[PDB]
Amino acid sequence: GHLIGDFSKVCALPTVSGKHQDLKYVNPETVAALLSGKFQGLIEKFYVIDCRYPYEYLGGHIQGALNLYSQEELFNFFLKKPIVPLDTQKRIIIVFHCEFERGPRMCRCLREEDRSLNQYPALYYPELYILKGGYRDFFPEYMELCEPQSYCPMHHQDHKTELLRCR
Amino acid sequence: GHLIGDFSKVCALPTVSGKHQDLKYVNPETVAALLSGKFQGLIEKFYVIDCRYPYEYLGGHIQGALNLYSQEELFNFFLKKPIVPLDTQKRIIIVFHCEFERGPRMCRCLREEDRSLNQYPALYYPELYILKGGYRDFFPEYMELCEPQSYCPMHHQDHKTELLRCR
């Protein structure tokens, strides 16, 4: 469990363990590394995809993260016009995340869609990662890398929540 | 995986899944239930054991939780004078937790110590649970059940953190 979706390469990001064994999990440290330009010459483009609802996303997100929370939005961003690297020796990666159900199904969706458009084992996106513990585990460790520097938990019909922050 | 340490009964708390299969995990909802007196006549005594360091504990803990973070402290609290239920038909339970390494080893420690003091399969504490995701997952869902209503992340020598709260 180290080769990318098209079996051509090995994973570029130091992967860790998680709930589903079919998915390739990552940790806050590596996302922090990616953001500071630690992988140039190896990874050309990278996308942090916040699958939460806009209100959660607007209440505090990883700097530069895109708020794609539906299948249609995700297909239109990534598959309508596939992103191709300028330097083919370098890679294009996607890191998905949620708060801490909806998040891994987006990863599965993109992959199922990518497979149906290609002749096996080719993919427009062979490298897909999930941030372990989501925003709830990244925010406390890398606040200065969050925008705004707050955390808006998911709203629950049954129990009240509210925006977490500090000074 | 439902019988208690002495095999005499079944688990009283709705258990869920977690990292280690040998441990019996629980979720914020059930802890919230326990606290409101939802199990009287079934569970006589219960203990929430915060294994974090005092500074983390003082910066926000589950209401009524005890701050036992060392093996010696844990042995002196629970095994020096074992707690026995007034009504033997009712049970005595222990819910351990950390922030989100040190936490499950306390659960293992108490159990190893309890086994060495008894003749198998008897235990002073057959029911031990771990709160899944720790304080990081309970605080956002049940702030009104936290004291103070804040969260103090663990301090890291390498990266800065600070107290999370709201209004």
Short mmCIF file of C-alpha atoms in Angstrom, two decimals:
data_model
loop_
_atom_site.label_atom_id
_atom_site.label_comp_id
_atom_site.label_asym_id
_atom_site.label_seq_id
_atom_site.Cartn_x
_atom_site.Cartn_y
_atom_site.Cartn_z
CA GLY A 1 0.00 0.00 0.00
CA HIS A 2 2.46 2.67 -1.30
CA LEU A 3 1.98 2.80 -5.09
CA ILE A 4 -0.21 5.57 -6.62
CA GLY A 5 -3.59 4.81 -8.36
CA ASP A 6 -1.87 4.13 -11.77
CA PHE A 7 0.89 1.93 -10.12
CA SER A 8 3.56 3.95 -12.07
CA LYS A 9 5.05 5.58 -8.89
CA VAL A 10 5.23 5.37 -5.08
CA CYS A 11 3.42 7.87 -2.72
CA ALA A 12 5.21 11.26 -2.54
CA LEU A 13 3.75 12.23 0.88
CA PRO A 14 4.74 10.42 4.09
CA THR A 15 1.49 8.51 4.58
CA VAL A 16 0.18 7.34 8.00
CA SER A 17 -2.67 4.92 9.13
CA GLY A 18 -6.45 5.51 9.23
CA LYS A 19 -10.04 4.06 9.52
CA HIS A 20 -10.32 2.63 5.96
CA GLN A 21 -7.25 0.65 4.65
CA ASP A 22 -8.12 1.46 0.97
CA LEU A 23 -7.47 5.23 1.60
CA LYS A 24 -4.01 6.86 1.97
CA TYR A 25 -4.04 9.12 5.15
CA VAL A 26 -1.76 12.07 5.94
CA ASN A 27 -1.05 14.23 9.06
CA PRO A 28 -1.02 18.02 9.85
CA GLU A 29 2.85 18.16 9.70
CA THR A 30 3.05 17.12 6.00
CA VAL A 31 0.23 19.54 4.98
CA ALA A 32 2.20 22.24 6.90
CA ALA A 33 5.34 21.10 4.94
CA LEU A 34 3.51 21.19 1.54
CA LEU A 35 2.30 24.78 2.19
CA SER A 36 5.83 26.13 2.92
CA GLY A 37 7.03 24.85 -0.49
CA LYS A 38 8.89 21.78 0.95
CA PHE A 39 8.15 19.58 -2.18
CA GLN A 40 9.02 21.78 -5.27
CA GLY A 41 10.75 19.67 -8.00
CA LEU A 42 8.83 16.59 -6.77
CA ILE A 43 5.16 17.99 -6.51
CA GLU A 44 4.24 20.75 -9.04
CA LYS A 45 0.57 21.37 -7.95
CA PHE A 46 -1.38 20.46 -4.81
CA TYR A 47 -4.96 20.97 -3.60
CA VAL A 48 -6.40 20.98 -0.08
CA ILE A 49 -10.11 20.25 -0.49
CA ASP A 50 -12.33 21.25 2.45
CA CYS A 51 -15.51 19.09 2.10
CA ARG A 52 -17.32 20.89 4.90
CA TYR A 53 -20.23 23.23 4.36
CA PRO A 54 -19.42 26.87 3.49
CA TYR A 55 -20.35 28.19 7.00
CA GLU A 56 -17.78 25.75 8.53
CA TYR A 57 -15.21 26.64 5.80
CA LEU A 58 -15.73 30.46 6.25
CA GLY A 59 -15.37 30.08 10.01
CA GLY A 60 -11.81 28.87 9.68
CA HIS A 61 -9.99 26.93 6.96
CA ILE A 62 -6.46 25.78 5.99
CA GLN A 63 -4.87 28.68 4.05
CA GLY A 64 -5.43 28.15 0.28
CA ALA A 65 -7.96 25.26 0.69
CA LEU A 66 -10.83 24.99 -1.72
CA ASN A 67 -14.36 24.55 -0.50
CA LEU A 68 -15.70 21.72 -2.74
CA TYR A 69 -18.49 19.91 -0.82
CA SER A 70 -20.59 18.27 -3.56
CA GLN A 71 -19.84 15.64 -6.26
CA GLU A 72 -20.88 17.98 -9.17
CA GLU A 73 -18.58 20.80 -7.86
CA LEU A 74 -15.71 18.29 -7.51
CA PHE A 75 -16.20 16.86 -11.04
CA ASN A 76 -16.33 20.43 -12.52
CA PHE A 77 -13.17 21.49 -10.70
CA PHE A 78 -10.97 18.43 -11.41
CA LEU A 79 -12.45 16.34 -14.27
CA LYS A 80 -14.23 18.69 -16.71
CA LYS A 81 -10.72 19.99 -17.67
CA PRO A 82 -8.10 17.68 -16.03
CA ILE A 83 -5.06 19.47 -14.50
CA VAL A 84 -1.86 18.32 -16.25
CA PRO A 85 1.67 19.03 -14.82
CA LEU A 86 3.99 21.36 -16.87
CA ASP A 87 6.93 19.09 -15.76
CA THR A 88 5.66 15.45 -16.12
CA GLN A 89 8.55 14.28 -13.82
CA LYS A 90 6.70 16.28 -11.07
CA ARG A 91 3.26 15.27 -9.66
CA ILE A 92 -0.26 16.78 -8.98
CA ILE A 93 -1.69 15.85 -5.54
CA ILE A 94 -5.07 16.19 -3.71
CA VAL A 95 -5.50 16.29 0.10
CA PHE A 96 -9.15 15.95 1.21
CA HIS A 97 -10.53 16.82 4.65
CA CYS A 98 -13.62 17.34 6.78
CA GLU A 99 -14.16 18.46 10.51
CA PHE A 100 -12.74 15.25 12.16
CA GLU A 101 -18.97 10.12 6.43
CA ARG A 102 -18.97 13.00 3.88
CA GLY A 103 -15.15 13.43 3.55
CA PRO A 104 -13.94 9.93 2.49
CA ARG A 105 -16.94 9.51 0.11
CA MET A 106 -15.67 12.59 -1.90
CA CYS A 107 -12.26 10.82 -2.23
CA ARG A 108 -14.05 7.67 -3.38
CA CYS A 109 -16.33 9.70 -5.77
CA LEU A 110 -13.42 11.50 -7.53
CA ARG A 111 -11.63 8.15 -7.98
CA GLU A 112 -14.75 6.24 -9.26
CA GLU A 113 -15.37 9.12 -11.77
CA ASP A 114 -11.65 9.22 -12.79
CA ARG A 115 -11.68 5.41 -13.42
CA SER A 116 -14.84 5.56 -15.59
CA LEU A 117 -13.15 8.23 -17.86
CA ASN A 118 -9.94 6.28 -18.40
CA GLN A 119 -8.68 2.93 -19.61
CA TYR A 120 -7.33 1.02 -16.54
CA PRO A 121 -5.02 1.63 -14.67
CA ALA A 122 -4.65 5.26 -15.97
CA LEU A 123 -5.99 8.21 -13.92
CA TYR A 124 -5.98 12.06 -14.16
CA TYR A 125 -5.50 11.98 -10.33
CA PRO A 126 -3.53 8.92 -9.09
CA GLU A 127 -2.45 10.65 -5.83
CA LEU A 128 -5.30 11.20 -3.34
CA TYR A 129 -4.81 11.73 0.40
CA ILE A 130 -7.06 12.30 3.45
CA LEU A 131 -5.95 14.58 6.33
CA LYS A 132 -6.27 12.38 9.51
CA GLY A 133 -8.55 14.00 12.13
CA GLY A 134 -9.53 16.84 9.77
CA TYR A 135 -9.57 20.51 10.68
CA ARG A 136 -10.17 19.68 14.40
CA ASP A 137 -6.64 18.23 14.58
CA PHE A 138 -4.89 20.66 12.28
CA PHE A 139 -6.24 23.99 13.70
CA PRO A 140 -4.84 23.43 17.27
CA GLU A 141 -1.43 22.42 15.92
CA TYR A 142 -1.04 25.06 13.11
CA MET A 143 -3.29 28.08 13.88
CA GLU A 144 -0.98 30.50 11.93
CA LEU A 145 -1.67 28.30 8.84
CA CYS A 146 -5.51 28.69 9.25
CA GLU A 147 -7.66 31.52 7.79
CA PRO A 148 -9.38 33.05 9.75
CA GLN A 149 -7.58 31.79 12.89
CA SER A 150 -10.78 30.23 14.23
CA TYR A 151 -12.70 26.96 14.08
CA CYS A 152 -16.39 26.69 13.31
CA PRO A 153 -17.73 23.28 14.32
CA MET A 154 -20.51 21.64 12.38
CA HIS A 155 -23.99 22.71 13.40
CA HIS A 156 -26.17 19.97 14.94
CA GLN A 157 -29.95 20.15 15.04
CA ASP A 158 -29.83 18.25 18.43
CA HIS A 159 -26.87 19.95 20.22
CA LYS A 160 -25.56 23.56 20.21
CA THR A 161 -21.94 24.38 19.20
CA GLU A 162 -20.02 27.70 18.49
CA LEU A 163 -16.83 29.28 17.02
CA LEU A 164 -13.60 28.47 18.87
CA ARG A 165 -10.71 31.01 18.93
CA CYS A 166 -7.97 32.72 21.12
CA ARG A 167 -5.60 35.81 21.68
CA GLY B 1 -16.02 -8.37 22.55
CA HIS B 2 -18.87 -7.36 24.93
CA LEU B 3 -18.21 -9.19 28.22
CA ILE B 4 -16.52 -7.31 31.12
CA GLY B 5 -12.97 -8.19 32.38
CA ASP B 6 -14.32 -10.92 34.78
CA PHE B 7 -16.68 -12.39 32.06
CA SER B 8 -19.58 -12.30 34.62
CA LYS B 9 -21.55 -9.55 32.73
CA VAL B 10 -21.90 -7.72 29.40
CA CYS B 11 -20.76 -4.04 28.86
CA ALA B 12 -23.19 -1.52 30.41
CA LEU B 13 -22.15 1.40 28.15
CA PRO B 14 -22.95 1.43 24.41
CA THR B 15 -19.43 0.77 23.17
CA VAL B 16 -18.11 1.91 19.73
CA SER B 17 -14.91 1.08 17.65
CA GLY B 18 -11.33 2.37 18.10
CA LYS B 19 -7.55 2.04 17.29
CA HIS B 20 -6.78 -0.98 19.54
CA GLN B 21 -9.32 -3.91 19.40
CA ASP B 22 -8.41 -5.05 22.98
CA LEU B 23 -9.83 -1.75 24.44
CA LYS B 24 -13.57 -0.89 24.80
CA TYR B 25 -14.16 2.67 23.34
CA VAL B 26 -17.02 5.07 24.11
CA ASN B 27 -18.33 8.37 22.60
CA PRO B 28 -19.15 11.89 23.97
CA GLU B 29 -22.95 11.17 23.94
CA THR B 30 -22.74 8.29 26.49
CA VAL B 31 -20.39 10.29 28.81
CA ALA B 32 -22.97 13.15 28.53
CA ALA B 33 -25.70 10.54 29.39
CA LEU B 34 -23.73 9.15 32.40
CA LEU B 35 -23.29 12.69 33.85
CA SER B 36 -27.06 13.49 33.75
CA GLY B 37 -27.78 10.38 35.86
CA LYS B 38 -29.08 8.26 32.90
CA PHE B 39 -27.73 4.93 34.40
CA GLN B 40 -28.84 4.90 38.14
CA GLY B 41 -29.95 1.36 39.20
CA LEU B 42 -27.54 -0.12 36.63
CA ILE B 43 -24.24 1.89 37.37
CA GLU B 44 -23.74 2.98 41.03
CA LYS B 45 -20.33 4.79 40.66
CA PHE B 46 -18.43 6.12 37.64
CA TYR B 47 -15.10 7.89 37.10
CA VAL B 48 -13.89 10.07 34.23
CA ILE B 49 -10.09 9.98 34.40
CA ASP B 50 -8.29 12.82 32.59
CA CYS B 51 -4.73 11.49 31.91
CA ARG B 52 -3.47 14.82 30.62
CA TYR B 53 -1.06 17.02 32.50
CA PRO B 54 -2.52 19.39 35.13
CA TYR B 55 -2.07 22.54 32.94
CA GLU B 56 -4.20 20.85 30.19
CA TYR B 57 -6.73 19.61 32.82
CA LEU B 58 -7.01 23.09 34.52
CA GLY B 59 -7.50 24.72 31.13
CA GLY B 60 -10.72 22.85 30.55
CA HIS B 61 -11.96 19.44 31.69
CA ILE B 62 -15.14 17.27 31.69
CA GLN B 63 -17.15 18.30 34.79
CA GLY B 64 -16.28 15.96 37.71
CA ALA B 65 -13.26 14.31 35.97
CA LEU B 66 -10.25 13.36 38.01
CA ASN B 67 -6.78 14.35 36.96
CA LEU B 68 -4.79 11.09 37.41
CA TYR B 69 -1.80 11.19 34.98
CA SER B 70 0.73 8.78 36.53
CA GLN B 71 0.67 5.04 37.36
CA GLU B 72 1.40 5.60 41.12
CA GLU B 73 -1.48 8.16 41.39
CA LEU B 74 -3.81 5.72 39.58
CA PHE B 75 -2.85 2.75 41.83
CA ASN B 76 -3.34 4.92 44.99
CA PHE B 77 -6.75 6.13 43.84
CA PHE B 78 -8.26 2.81 42.67
CA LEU B 79 -6.24 -0.14 44.05
CA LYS B 80 -4.81 0.83 47.46
CA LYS B 81 -8.45 0.69 48.77
CA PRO B 82 -10.65 -0.85 46.00
CA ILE B 83 -14.07 0.84 45.49
CA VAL B 84 -16.87 -1.68 46.16
CA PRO B 85 -20.55 -1.02 45.13
CA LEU B 86 -23.15 -0.67 47.97
CA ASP B 87 -25.65 -2.52 45.65
CA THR B 88 -23.66 -5.45 44.08
CA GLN B 89 -26.40 -5.75 41.34
CA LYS B 90 -25.15 -2.27 40.20
CA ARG B 91 -21.66 -1.66 38.68
CA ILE B 92 -18.56 0.64 39.11
CA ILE B 93 -17.17 2.00 35.80
CA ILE B 94 -14.04 3.93 34.64
CA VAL B 95 -13.85 6.14 31.51
CA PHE B 96 -10.28 7.18 30.60
CA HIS B 97 -9.31 10.01 28.26
CA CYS B 98 -6.51 12.18 26.92
CA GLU B 99 -6.42 15.21 24.41
CA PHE B 100 -7.27 13.18 21.22
CA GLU B 101 0.17 7.12 23.66
CA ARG B 102 -0.25 8.13 27.35
CA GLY B 103 -4.05 7.55 27.64
CA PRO B 104 -4.48 3.86 26.59
CA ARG B 105 -1.33 2.84 28.54
CA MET B 106 -3.06 4.04 31.80
CA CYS B 107 -6.02 1.73 30.94
CA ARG B 108 -3.59 -1.11 30.32
CA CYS B 109 -1.61 -0.28 33.55
CA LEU B 110 -4.72 -0.31 35.83
CA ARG B 111 -5.78 -3.66 34.31
CA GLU B 112 -2.28 -5.30 34.55
CA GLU B 113 -2.09 -4.16 38.24
CA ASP B 114 -5.69 -5.36 38.94
CA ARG B 115 -4.88 -8.82 37.43
CA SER B 116 -1.69 -9.24 39.52
CA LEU B 117 -3.74 -8.59 42.76
CA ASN B 118 -6.46 -11.11 41.99
CA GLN B 119 -6.96 -14.76 41.14
CA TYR B 120 -8.09 -14.95 37.45
CA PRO B 121 -10.57 -13.90 36.07
CA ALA B 122 -11.58 -11.69 39.09
CA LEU B 123 -10.97 -7.91 39.02
CA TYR B 124 -11.72 -4.88 41.29
CA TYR B 125 -12.40 -2.99 37.99
CA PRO B 126 -13.80 -5.22 35.19
CA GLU B 127 -15.38 -2.27 33.31
CA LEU B 128 -12.84 0.07 31.67
CA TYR B 129 -13.65 2.42 28.78
CA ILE B 130 -11.74 4.97 26.64
CA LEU B 131 -13.45 8.17 25.37
CA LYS B 132 -12.87 8.12 21.54
CA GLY B 133 -11.12 11.31 20.33
CA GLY B 134 -10.58 12.57 23.89
CA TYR B 135 -11.32 16.08 25.10
CA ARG B 136 -10.79 17.51 21.56
CA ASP B 137 -13.97 15.72 20.42
CA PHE B 138 -16.03 16.13 23.56
CA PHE B 139 -15.45 19.90 24.23
CA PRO B 140 -16.91 21.07 20.84
CA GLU B 141 -19.97 18.84 21.24
CA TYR B 142 -20.71 19.43 25.00
CA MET B 143 -19.15 22.76 26.09
CA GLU B 144 -21.78 23.25 28.90
CA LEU B 145 -20.49 19.93 30.37
CA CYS B 146 -16.83 21.23 30.45
CA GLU B 147 -15.20 23.19 33.33
CA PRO B 148 -13.93 25.84 32.59
CA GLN B 149 -15.63 26.12 29.17
CA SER B 150 -12.27 26.20 27.39
CA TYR B 151 -9.73 23.81 25.87
CA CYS B 152 -6.02 23.91 26.59
CA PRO B 153 -4.10 21.92 23.99
CA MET B 154 -0.94 20.08 24.91
CA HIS B 155 2.19 22.19 24.83
CA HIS B 156 4.78 21.20 22.19
CA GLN B 157 8.43 22.15 22.42
CA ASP B 158 8.50 22.38 18.53
CA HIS B 159 5.16 24.15 17.77
CA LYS B 160 3.17 26.85 19.64
CA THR B 161 -0.48 26.26 20.72
CA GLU B 162 -2.97 28.23 22.98
CA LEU B 163 -6.32 28.11 24.88
CA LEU B 164 -9.43 27.80 22.70
CA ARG B 165 -12.77 29.35 23.85
CA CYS B 166 -15.90 31.38 22.75
CA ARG B 167 -18.87 33.75 23.80
#
